[PDB]
Amino acid sequence: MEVIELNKCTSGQSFEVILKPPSDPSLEEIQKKLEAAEERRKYQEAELLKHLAE
């Protein structure tokens, strides 16, 4: 039961107690993902219009 690094100030204090010792995607790659999904949306919509045109 040891207390270490006791720091005190006007607004409080803080300390540590030890009971026992121990034993990314680049900006380019994010644009591709965003545009790839935008492309799959455009494709699905074109197939909707193609169906409606028939």
Binding site: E45, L48, L49, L52
Partner: protein, 425 residues
Amino acid sequence: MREIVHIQAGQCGNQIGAKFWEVISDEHGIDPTGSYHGDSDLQLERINVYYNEATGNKYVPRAILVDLEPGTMDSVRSGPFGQIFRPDNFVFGQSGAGNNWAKGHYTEGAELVDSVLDVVRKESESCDCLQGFQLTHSLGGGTGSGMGTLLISKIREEYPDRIMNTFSVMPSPKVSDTVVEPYNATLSVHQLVENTDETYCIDNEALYDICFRTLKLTTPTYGDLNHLVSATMSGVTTCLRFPGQLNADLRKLAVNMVPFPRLHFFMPGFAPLTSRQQYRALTVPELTQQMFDSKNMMAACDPRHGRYLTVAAIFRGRMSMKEVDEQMLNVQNKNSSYFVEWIPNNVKTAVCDIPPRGLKMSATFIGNSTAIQELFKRISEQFTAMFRRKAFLHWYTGEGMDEMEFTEAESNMNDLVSEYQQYQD
């Protein structure tokens, strides 16, 4: 500012749509002349969802009245709230559709549809942010069924990413006008499978049995049936017309009610349904017991024959929201055999403070049940009983249709029945 554009087509469509605007106009304090006279700010918070605001603080419904014959819309224009509709929003022909889906969809209807879309485009261009469209119509006639589904096809083409919603009255031999109603309903159902995000199935037989057995109306009329539709349409749209912690626009509802794109046909319900003992206060248990009782449902499908994919209940009036959850959590935990166990928490509840006119409290029921396959099975059987003998087909081949298109409607409907069946096991 999430505006909805309302369309009503054909006799049934315009008669049911008329009462709907009558009911909700009363709830929002809008008189027949468009002037507001309510006493609560809640009545206006979401008023722009269904009404446009003109000069002089006038509120004009965002509604488009469509028909291929003048008669029905002359009645509306002379009806109670007939003066409230925008005069330009009446679009009608003179030929009629003769209860013929081909005439509404391919011949007479085609000649008029472009001018209807001109009005739709006009109302859309003035919306700050358009939620989507809602259509009221029957499937058994010619204009609402044939031209209605033609309108939907042309609205989806021009507004591919907007929500398309319909209230669809399904025909029944017990409440029938002509024998070709199964033909028109089977042809429309396929259009709805493809081009609607949500369809509220209203079966005239269910409306009839309710007026006969529950409401104890000796001789029901179309007017009586339309009173139930008005009340139900007002109940399902309460989520959209008033404020609440739920928010919920058309797309958010669809995302939570439709787990598969084609299975988007709902069974509505209402409570109370009392006969003239009408002043007795209704407790929360009785509202809940009736709301889930089949005799309170309007699809004429026994829910105990299928399974609920998703269920939404809306309670209106000043009541115990704690006791609402208790009774709802009681119906589920007492009949958990009729709820699919692979959609967690598929029963949602919402409370609204303003009750319908003349009721301390009410409950509207919205179920996406696989039991709806019984309705489509009925239509299919009646279709095939006539089509196997090609009875009455000449009315349709005379309009340019071929037998193959009927064969395809049959297969499309039987596929739909097969799709519901696989999710019921």
